[PDB]
Ligand binder design. Structure first.
Ligand SMILES: [Ca+2]
Ligand SMILES: [Ca+2]
Ligand SMILES: [Ca+2]
Ligand SMILES: [Ca+2]
Ligand SMILES: [Ca+2]
Ligand SMILES: [Ca+2]
Ligand SMILES: [Ca+2]
Ligand SMILES: [Cl-]
Ligand SMILES: [Cl-]
Ligand SMILES: [Cl-]
Ligand SMILES: [Cl-]
Ligand SMILES: [Zn+2]
Ligand SMILES: [Zn+2]
Lengths: 380, 7
């Protein structure tokens, strides 16, 4: 467990310097044909550095001239024999006090290295190489440009987590306010590959711009299938994301224990708020609002379903079968339990769905619905 | 201590 702070030193921040080498006396690997970073490489390298400082307590300051630096960047083009090397990609040296520690090197004969802003593998390579220079040891043609779930955990173990990042209400995906290219989709042709770090506020996964059937999971540490890819989005350990918006596809939106606002969008969606007081919008289409236990919608913290469509949407209470299939009752409970009732509040046009579970002395489950609902909309 | 990235 090597870091810039030493060996087996955990949770300690670092202030590091970096430098784009303009010349070298030698490359520590023995490769030759040094070429300095071009303008695009410089911009993309800084974006990679930023993606690391976003998640862990690292500060990076550029130095120039003859000043030494913790982390350095340079290209090579030839092997130790002086022959052209068009085959290799990049490498980096771990932190330490030895010559070349923290240095990272990239093959200028690779177009992805020269053009990391338009060839995604180049940006990913920068991020990856920097990870090693910091002490880390280890999708349909696209490459994630920022640290993924395990590396976020690992780098935070070394340097501590950055609790100042995006502490406001943050939106990831379409309509993003992150000012990070890897969290931003500007149109439906853009692929998203990221693991979100977010240190506070009420946040949204906006994947509204895609037509693919998506699976969006708001659980900490969980993976989502977004924009037609699989497992391309995850939520880092230590992060709570609150809201999700699906696209025009037939989606599955899985909430977490927090109070979530879930919007299915068009298409026939499945929405599962989970624990907490959730607000659910199925959107256009034949949507299903799923309840997996009495704890999903207690009276003290009940769900709202804000756009329910009688005769079109469904509410799934089949999970309650495990203690005896629910019986639907018209306007009164018997006291026997395992009963469900739809109660119409004519003054406010709200339907209250009350569910009385066996063994409960009071009716403890409620979902409030803005609109009418029928017995035949309820799956028991 | 050097780590290589795949090409
Ligand atoms: Ca936030
Ligand atoms: Ca949050
Ligand atoms: Ca949808
Ligand atoms: Ca929830
Ligand atoms: Ca829908
Ligand atoms: Ca609907
Ligand atoms: Ca809930
Ligand atoms: Cl050849
Ligand atoms: Cl939950
Ligand atoms: Cl639809
Ligand atoms: Cl509809
Ligand atoms: Zn690696
Ligand atoms: Zn892409």
């Amino acid at each position: 467990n090597v870091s810039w702070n030493g060996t087996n030193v955990f949770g300690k921040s670092a202030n590091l310097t970096f430098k784009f080498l303009q010349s070298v006396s030698s490359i520590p690997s023995g490769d030759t044909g040094f070429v300095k970073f071009n303008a695009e490489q410089i911009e993309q390298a800084k974006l990679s550095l930023q993606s690391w400082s976003d998640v862990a307590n690292l500060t990076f300051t550029e130095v120039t001239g003859n000043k030494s630096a913790n982390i350095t960047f340079g290209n090579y083009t030839r092997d130790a024999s002086g022959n052209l090397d068009y085959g290799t990609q990049a490498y980096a040296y771990y932190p330490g006090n030895y010559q070349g520690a923290g240095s990272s090197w990239y093959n200028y004969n690779q177009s992805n290295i020269r053009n990391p802003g338009s060839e995604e593998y180049g940006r990913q390579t920068f991020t990856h190489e920097i990870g090693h220079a910091l002490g880390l040891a280890h999708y349909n043609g696209h490459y994630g440009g920022a640290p993924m779930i395990d590396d976020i955990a690992a780098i935070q173990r070394l340097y501590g987590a950055n609790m100042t990042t995006r502490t406001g209400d943050s939106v990831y995906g379409f309509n993003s306010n992150t000012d990070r290219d890897f969290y931003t989709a500007t149109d439906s042709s853009k692929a998203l590959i990221f693991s979100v770090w977010d240190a506070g506020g009420t946040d949204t996964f906006d994947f509204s711009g895609y037509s693919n059937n998506q699976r969006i999971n708001l659980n900490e540490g969980s993976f989502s299938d977004v924009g037609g890819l699989k497992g391309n989005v995850s939520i880092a350990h230590g992060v709570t994301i609150e809201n999700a918006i699906g696209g025009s596809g037939n989606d599955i939106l899985v909430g977490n224990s927090a109070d979530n606002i879930l919007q299915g969008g068009a298409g026939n969606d499945v929405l599962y708020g989970g624990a907490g007081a959730d607000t659910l919008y199925g959107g256009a289409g034949r949507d299903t609002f799923v309840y997996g236990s009495g704890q999903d919608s207690t009276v003290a913290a009940y769900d709202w379903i804000a756009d329910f469509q009688k005769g079109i949407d469904k509410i799934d209470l089949s999970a309650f079968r495990n203690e005896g299939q629910l019986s639907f009752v018209q306007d009164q409970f018997t006291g026997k339990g395992q009963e469900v009732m739809l109660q119409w509040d004519a003054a406010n046009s709200i339907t209250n769905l009350w569910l009385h579970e066996a063994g409960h002395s009071s009716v403890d489950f409620l979902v409030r619905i803005v609109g009418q609902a029928a017995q035949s909309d309820i799956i028991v | 201590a050097k780590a290589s990235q795949a090409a």
